[PDB]
Copies of this chain bind each other. A is one copy, B any other.
Amino acid sequence: ETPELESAVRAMEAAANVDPLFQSALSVFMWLEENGIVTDMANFALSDPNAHRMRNFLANA
């Protein structure tokens, strides 16, 4: 309900609507946010900076 949050979501949607890859990133953001794990994912990224562990997990799904 902060003006910054509402403005950022509008701007992200505008970028997503002109680039499928950014749309995919926005979809990930919305999924992480709805599930309360955005900061948890950022913490994981610090532990796995080159995504070696994450790639293996995503691949064997």
Contact = CB atoms under 8 A, between A and B. Distances in A.
Interface of A: 2, 4-5, 7-8, 10-12, 14-15, 17-25, 27-29, 31-33, 35-45, 47-51, 53-55, 57-59, 61
B14 A39 contact: no
B4 A8 contact: no
Contacts of A24: 38-39, 41-42
Number of copies of this protein chain within its complex: 2
Contacts of A41: 24, 28, 54, 58
B44 A61 contact: yes
A28 B45 contact: yes
B4 A19 contact: yes
